Design a protein around this nucleic acid. Structure first.
Length: 135
DNA sequence: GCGGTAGTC
Protein backbone atom coordinates (compact mmCIF):
# COMPACT_ATOMS: atom_id res chain seq x y z
CA UNK A 1 0.00 0.00 0.00
CA UNK A 2 1.09 3.66 -0.11
CA UNK A 3 3.58 4.20 2.71
CA UNK A 4 5.80 7.08 3.74
CA UNK A 5 9.59 6.78 3.91
CA UNK A 6 12.40 9.18 4.74
CA UNK A 7 15.39 9.68 2.44
CA UNK A 8 18.65 11.52 2.80
CA UNK A 9 19.70 13.40 -0.30
CA UNK A 10 23.18 13.89 -1.69
CA UNK A 11 24.78 17.22 -0.75
CA UNK A 12 22.93 19.95 -2.63
CA UNK A 13 20.94 17.48 -4.76
CA UNK A 14 17.65 17.65 -2.90
CA UNK A 15 15.73 19.60 -5.52
CA UNK A 16 17.19 17.16 -8.03
CA UNK A 17 15.96 14.15 -6.07
CA UNK A 18 12.55 15.74 -5.74
CA UNK A 19 12.52 16.11 -9.50
CA UNK A 20 13.42 12.58 -10.40
CA UNK A 21 11.17 11.08 -7.72
CA UNK A 22 8.13 13.10 -8.72
CA UNK A 23 8.84 12.01 -12.33
CA UNK A 24 8.38 8.43 -11.10
CA UNK A 25 5.02 9.30 -9.43
CA UNK A 26 6.51 9.32 -5.90
CA UNK A 27 5.01 11.98 -3.64
CA UNK A 28 7.73 14.15 -2.10
CA UNK A 29 7.66 16.31 1.02
CA UNK A 30 10.40 18.70 2.17
CA UNK A 31 8.76 20.83 4.82
CA UNK A 32 9.99 24.32 5.57
CA UNK A 33 9.77 26.19 8.83
CA UNK A 34 9.55 29.93 9.32
CA UNK A 35 11.46 31.10 12.37
CA UNK A 36 13.41 34.04 13.76
CA UNK A 37 17.15 33.84 13.08
CA UNK A 38 19.99 36.44 13.20
CA UNK A 39 21.04 37.84 9.84
CA UNK A 40 23.61 40.67 9.75
CA UNK A 41 23.40 40.92 13.51
CA UNK A 42 19.66 41.66 13.31
CA UNK A 43 16.87 39.35 14.37
CA UNK A 44 14.68 38.61 11.32
CA UNK A 45 12.37 35.90 9.97
CA UNK A 46 13.67 33.24 7.59
CA UNK A 47 12.18 30.16 5.95
CA UNK A 48 14.54 27.20 5.99
CA UNK A 49 14.23 23.40 5.54
CA UNK A 50 12.78 21.80 8.64
CA UNK A 51 15.14 18.80 8.24
CA UNK A 52 18.04 19.76 5.98
CA UNK A 53 18.70 17.41 3.08
CA UNK A 54 15.93 15.02 4.16
CA UNK A 55 12.88 14.23 2.03
CA UNK A 56 9.75 12.36 3.03
CA UNK A 57 8.50 10.23 0.15
CA UNK A 58 5.30 8.24 -0.30
CA UNK A 59 5.01 5.36 -2.71
CA UNK A 60 3.69 1.79 -2.81
CA UNK A 61 6.67 -0.51 -2.38
CA UNK A 62 4.80 -3.17 -4.36
CA UNK A 63 4.50 -0.82 -7.31
CA UNK A 64 7.83 0.98 -7.12
CA UNK A 65 10.67 -0.97 -5.51
CA UNK A 66 12.79 0.58 -2.81
CA UNK A 67 15.76 -0.51 -4.91
CA UNK A 68 14.39 1.80 -7.60
CA UNK A 69 14.11 4.71 -5.12
CA UNK A 70 17.60 3.80 -3.81
CA UNK A 71 18.85 4.29 -7.39
CA UNK A 72 17.09 7.61 -8.04
CA UNK A 73 19.19 10.57 -9.05
CA UNK A 74 19.84 12.78 -6.05
CA UNK A 75 19.11 10.10 -3.45
CA UNK A 76 21.80 9.14 -0.96
CA UNK A 77 19.94 6.60 1.19
CA UNK A 78 16.83 5.60 3.14
CA UNK A 79 16.58 6.15 6.83
CA UNK A 80 16.42 2.57 8.06
CA UNK A 81 14.70 0.83 10.97
CA UNK A 82 17.00 -2.14 11.30
CA UNK A 83 18.25 -3.31 7.93
CA UNK A 84 15.28 -2.06 5.94
CA UNK A 85 13.75 1.33 5.10
CA UNK A 86 11.89 2.89 8.00
CA UNK A 87 8.18 3.20 7.23
CA UNK A 88 7.34 6.55 8.76
CA UNK A 89 4.04 6.14 10.63
CA UNK A 90 1.31 8.36 9.25
CA UNK A 91 0.87 9.89 12.71
CA UNK A 92 4.31 11.44 12.27
CA UNK A 93 3.40 12.79 8.84
CA UNK A 94 0.13 14.14 10.16
CA UNK A 95 2.02 16.28 12.66
CA UNK A 96 3.71 18.06 9.79
CA UNK A 97 0.26 19.35 8.62
CA UNK A 98 -1.39 11.66 16.04
CA UNK A 99 0.59 10.04 18.92
CA UNK A 100 1.78 11.47 22.22
CA UNK A 101 5.46 10.80 21.59
CA UNK A 102 4.79 12.13 18.11
CA UNK A 103 2.99 15.21 19.40
CA UNK A 104 5.66 16.08 21.95
CA UNK A 105 8.51 15.03 19.72
CA UNK A 106 7.32 17.62 17.24
CA UNK A 107 6.74 20.25 19.89
CA UNK A 108 10.46 19.90 20.53
CA UNK A 109 11.29 19.86 16.83
CA UNK A 110 9.28 22.95 16.03
CA UNK A 111 10.99 24.95 18.76
CA UNK A 112 14.54 23.77 17.89
CA UNK A 113 16.14 26.55 15.75
CA UNK A 114 19.05 24.46 14.34
CA UNK A 115 18.11 22.19 11.46
CA UNK A 116 20.63 19.45 12.17
CA UNK A 117 19.33 19.17 15.69
CA UNK A 118 15.78 19.06 14.29
CA UNK A 119 16.72 16.10 12.06
CA UNK A 120 18.40 14.26 14.90
CA UNK A 121 15.22 14.82 16.86
CA UNK A 122 13.28 13.50 13.92
CA UNK A 123 15.23 10.33 13.53
CA UNK A 124 14.89 9.57 17.24
CA UNK A 125 11.17 10.18 17.13
CA UNK A 126 10.65 7.89 14.14
CA UNK A 127 12.64 5.14 15.83
CA UNK A 128 10.64 5.47 19.05
CA UNK A 129 7.28 5.60 17.25
CA UNK A 130 8.06 2.50 15.16
CA UNK A 131 9.23 0.52 18.19
CA UNK A 132 5.96 1.56 19.86
CA UNK A 133 3.97 -0.10 17.04
CA UNK A 134 5.69 -3.46 17.68
CA UNK A 135 4.26 -6.27 19.84
C1' DG B 1 30.40 3.26 -3.11
C1' DC B 2 29.28 5.12 -7.22
C1' DG B 3 25.78 6.38 -10.24
C1' DG B 4 21.89 5.12 -10.36
C1' DT B 5 15.97 6.27 -11.62
C1' DA B 6 21.34 -0.78 -11.44
C1' DG B 7 24.69 -3.42 -10.95
C1' DT B 8 25.99 -11.24 -15.29
C1' DC B 9 29.39 -3.64 -10.73
Amino acid sequence: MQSWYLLYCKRGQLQRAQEHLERQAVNCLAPMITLEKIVRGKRTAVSEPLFPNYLFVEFDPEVIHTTTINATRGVSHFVRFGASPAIVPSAVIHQLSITEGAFEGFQAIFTEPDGEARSMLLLNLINKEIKHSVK
